[model samples]
Structures are given as structure tokens and as C-alpha cells.
Target: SMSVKKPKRDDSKDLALCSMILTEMETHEDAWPFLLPVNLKLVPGYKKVIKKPMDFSTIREKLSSGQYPNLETFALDVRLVFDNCETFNEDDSDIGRAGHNMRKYFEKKWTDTFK
Candidate 1:
């Protein structure tokens, strides 16, 4: 019988990108809720690292305080991850659309509440 080699994990690089995004979220609380669901879904293991209970109240508090200064940096971090996900493809057309959608979703909520 022949034994097959296990597939290598290519996601480590992606995971590092994800970690940077999460770190941004930690510093800039406004981006937290918008980024959290996607992060949790992609990296379930992060639940152990992020012990704090996340909720709308926490999101609202962060935004109210205006702690996040680098929205463009956060968006760039997300774009890099979104671009690299093999599932999203190299052309990144869909990823661009998805990014736009995500930005719109968060923008709507952020504007409605913060305005």
C-alpha cells in the first residue's frame, strides 16, 4: 500500500494577515463588529484568543469614543486578506464587490448611529 503525504497548510500567511486585521480592530473599536463575524467565521480558533464577550453595546461604546484613527489602514488590511483568499480567486473582481458591499453595510450602520 502506498502512503500519501498530507497537504501543507497554505493558510498560515492568510492567518497572519487576519491577525493584523484583528489587531487593528482591537485598537480601533469602530471596526470591530463589522470585521468580527467574518474573522470568527474564517478563524474559529481565535475565540480562545479573544476572551472578551463581543456585542453591539461594546461596538457602540467604541464608536462613541472615536478611538479608531486609521480607517484607511483597516480597509487596506481587509482588502489584502480578501484578495488573498484563494476561494475569492486571483482576478479579485468578486472580492472587490464583496469589499464594497461590506463597506456599504458598515457605513450605513455607522452613519445612522453616529450622525
Candidate 2:
């Protein structure tokens, strides 16, 4: 196969990096709460409290569909997962701690990969 044309840096590389990071994040033990969307039936007022609901599965779907135009957009969704958790759960709560842990893990991975 012909060498893949190397174009100026674009979302292609960003998307691939995101996919890798996402998989790593999912593997984390604390990632269980973020692995899927929050259950509105189980958690009342979730929608009212969290304006923009975000989860790993949703982010992955968006990434797969090319909805993330850039890495920043992808990062926002990842951050939102934690931000929303912090908003709804107290820092001392189990889920809240998990969110904080995952956020830190993600940032480290992101920084090492990009910055």
C-alpha cells in the first residue's frame, strides 16, 4: 500500500489519540460510574442539576460519529463527565472521588500525549 499521505496536523491524529486515551480511562477501576450515562430513573433531578450530561460511552459515540471537530471539543466532553459528577455528588462521596481520580488520570494522560 502506498505510504499514507501525511497532511498538516489534523483531527485524524487527535481522534486516534482520543480513542486510545478513552480506552485507558475506561480500564481504570474508578471509571465504572462514568462508563455509561447516568440513569435518570435511579438518580432523580440529574437532568435538572446537570445541564449537559456527558459520559464515556456518549463521548465515544460522538467521537465515532465525527461530532468532535477538534481535540478541544473532545476534551470538553471528557471534562464534563467529571464536572457533572462534582456538581451532583459531594467530594467525599464514592462516585465523586471516582470522578476526581479519573479526571486526574485523564489529564496526566492528555498532558503526556499532547503537552
Candidate 3:
């Protein structure tokens, strides 16, 4: 493994904004064709981890759940979903358009988050 841990920061401010960004990006099922790394979402099992197609709806609900803890991890999860999306290849593709819109929204609110 070659990952360095970021010193934990107060990312609660990022939680709601991340939630909104994820909501928009996950709206179109076609926006996600690639499965997240198994290490990202694999459940405890009797065997080794395996990759699985993402279910944005499931994640969104979890994100929206007030009871769900660990806001930073949730933000990372959302980031990875967008980072790993493989459906929109061309800039003109539908999922690309969708991603563009989501990015626009994120940018519009980025500086003001938790301000």
C-alpha cells in the first residue's frame, strides 16, 4: 500500500455541499458505468474483496441519512464516484453533460460552503 493519510480536518462543512454535488451527479444512472474499487465499497465477507457496480441511489440515501456518521468518508465516497465514472467519455456525451452541470453547481457553491 502506498497511501498517505491526510491529517483529519473539519470536513463537516464539506458534508452538505458534497451531498448536493453527489445528488446531481448520481441522478442519471448512465453517468456511472464503472464499478468503484472493491476496496471502496466491499462488505465484510467470507472471501476476498470484489468490485461491484455502484448504486448511487443507495449511497445517496446513506448520505442523506442524518444518522449516518463519518462525514469525511462519505465525502470521499462521493468524490470517488465522480472520479471513477466511465460513462461519459466524450465532452459531448450525455453523462459528460450531466457531469458538467454537476461541476458547475459545485463551483458556484464551492467558495461559500460553510461560510
Candidate 4:
């Protein structure tokens, strides 16, 4: 015989952090176009952290339902995320070292995601 068990409780603060980051990114015109490429890397944490999961389906539904008002607002949130990542910490070496690299990554990601 076999038994089934539910998944463990979620403790994914990083995910919420990522979502907050994304929400921030959506606010900047410079960063808005760069969302698609980096979204996958950034989205996982949000799902893990939240009690409910977030998916493209939900996003599409919201958009279709006009709940978002406009895509610009959502895009702005994405831009803000990248901007926040660039300036997350001034003193931390890891953040400092990756600052430029992160910006470059967003640029590349944006181009690719949109292309």
C-alpha cells in the first residue's frame, strides 16, 4: 500500500521579494521593455513565497478582465524591479559587483523577450 502527503509549508520570502521587485520594475519606461527575458528567473520566487501561486494564466485573465487598467502600469512595475535590483544595496559587495552586470542582463533580457 502507498500513502499520499501534501507539500510542505511555504517559506519563500525571496519569491515575495522578487514579486515586489517586479512590481517596482513595471513603473519605469526604461525598464518596461526588458521584462520578458528576466521574468522567468524572477517569477519563481513569487510563486514559492505566496500562499497562492502566480501564473501567466492569471496574468492573462486579469488583463482580459481589464482589472489592470492598462499594460503600461504592469510594464512599469517590471521596469521598477530591475531598477531596484540595480540599487538594492550600496554597501554590499555582491550587489555592488553585480550592479553593472545586472543592468546588462536586463538589457539583453529585454531585447530577447521582446524580440
Candidate 5:
């Protein structure tokens, strides 16, 4: 009852997109750390900007586990995760835009599906 997963579908298209965006953040290593406060050293292989960046598998598992039951909630979580970016407001930063883009994706999907 807690999961947003469609009974007929095993995986959520929306969650997959969210996971991809999170993964994209990892490759943008420099700007990714800007999501966190201060000039903390970041290992090239991982993103420390978010406390526990979830991969596709993890995101899938959590969503499947009912961690976030719907797009609205998931989008909120995405914003909360990315909103902490130190450069969240910077128009020139890709990582900043990535966060925005992730939220926007969910919002658009929300409107299209629920409207």
C-alpha cells in the first residue's frame, strides 16, 4: 500500500529517470561538490555533495521498498537533496542546473500524468 509501483509494472519510469539524474551528478564531480557547503575535498570517484547519493539500483530498491511512494514525494526528495547545493542558484553551473533539471522532470511528468 505504500509503494507507488503500478501493480502491472515492475519498474517505474519516473524512478529510473531520477536515478539517471543522480548518476549524472556523479560525473559532474567538480560542480557536484558545490552542492555541499564549504570547499570539502571530494574523491574523484564519488560524490559527497549529497549525504548518500543513490544509484539506479538503490533508488529502484528504495522506491520499490516504498521509501517514496509517488512522483510528488520523489520530486520533493530530489529537490531537498539537490537544494543544498552551494551553487544552487548559480545560472552558469551545470550541477546547479542538474538539480533544477531533475526537479523539473518530475514536475512535468506529474502534470502530464495527473492532469
Candidate 6:
């Protein structure tokens, strides 16, 4: 009953653009932490600090499933990934710096492509 026809094509320009940027985010050097969900065992307090955890893989999944109807929703998750990182890691730390870099990259890409 769960099996259904999957849409093989993305009709929206927003979806295609988001997919392209998502690939870049995945390949970025500083994408290590944001690539997947944080390890709850290592960072026990993450759940407390970040109520809504976001990551590249999750975004990719959402994109694949057509969950984002507009670019705004997609952009929100992208920002959330970095925002959560800043909240959990100190600005001077490796992850913190990476988060900043990744966020900067996304912002520039967003402005260049759409704004």
C-alpha cells in the first residue's frame, strides 16, 4: 500500500536550482558536520539546543521527495543547518568556522542565482 509512483521529473525552476546548490553544499570542504545528522551520543545537548535539526542529507532527501514547494522553504532549511551549528559550537571552533563558511557560500549563491 505504501508503494506509489514516484515523480522522476522536477517541474519547478526552484527545485532544480535548489538541487544544484545542494550538490555544491555536499561537496564543500567544510561540509563534514552538516552532511548528516549530528551524533546524539557525542553531542547529547544538541537536541536541547537545536529544536529543529537540519542537515545536507535531510535536505537532499526532501528535495528528492518534492517536499519544498518554493525556494523560500528550501532556503530556510539551508540556513537552519548553519544556525544550529553556531548555536552548538563556539565561533572560534572548527565546526563553527566551517558553519560560517558554508553559510556564506550559500548566501552568495542564493543572491547570485535568485536575488
Highest-lDDT candidate: 2
RMSD list, candidates in order: 16.5, 5.7, 9.3, 15.9, 8.0, 7.5
* Span of 10 residues, lowest total lDDT, candidate 2: 4-13
In candidate 2, stretches whose alpha carbon ends up further than 4 angstroms from where it belongs are: 1-11
Q: Rate the local accuracy (lDDT) of all candidates.
A: 0.43, 0.91, 0.52, 0.44, 0.52, 0.89
Q: List residue ranges in candidate 5 displaced over 4 A.
A: 1-58, 69-72, 86-89
In candidate 2, how many Å is residue 101 off? 0.4
Question: What digit string (tens of lDDT, one per residue) describes model 4 on residues 4-86?
Answer: 77775543443333344344444434433333433545765533333333333344345445566443454444345445554
Question: Candidate 5 clashing pairs?
Answer: 35-85
Q: Give each model a TM-score.
A: 0.26, 0.89, 0.43, 0.30, 0.42, 0.87
- Name the regions of candidate 3 deviating beyond 4 angstroms: 1-55, 64-68, 86-88
Query: Residue 25: error of model 1 in Å?
Result: 12
Candidate 3 lDDT over 13-60, as tens digits, reads: 665776775665555454444222333434354123223333456567
Look at candidate 2 and tell me the lDDT of residue 24.
99
Q: How good is model 4 by TM-score?
A: 0.30
Candidate 5 to truth, TM: 0.42
Candidate 6 lDDT tens digits, 1-115: 2778676554357778888999998999989989889977788798777899999999999989989878889999999999898888999999999999999999999999887
Residue 112, model 3: lDDT of: 57
Clashes of each: 0, 0, 0, 18, 1, 0
Model 6 stretches astray by more than 4 angstroms: 1-11
Q: Which order, best to worst by lDDT? A: 2, 6, 5, 3, 4, 1
Instruction: Put down candidate 1 lDDT per residue, 50-108, tens digits, no spaces.
Output: 44334333333444465434344334444443333323323345544554554455445
lDDT per residue for candidate 2 within 4-49, as digits (tens), equals 7777664457878999999999899999999999998888899788
**Which candidate has the highest TM-score of all?**
2
| Model 2 vs. true fold: TM | 0.89
Candidate 2: Cα lDDT at 94 = 94
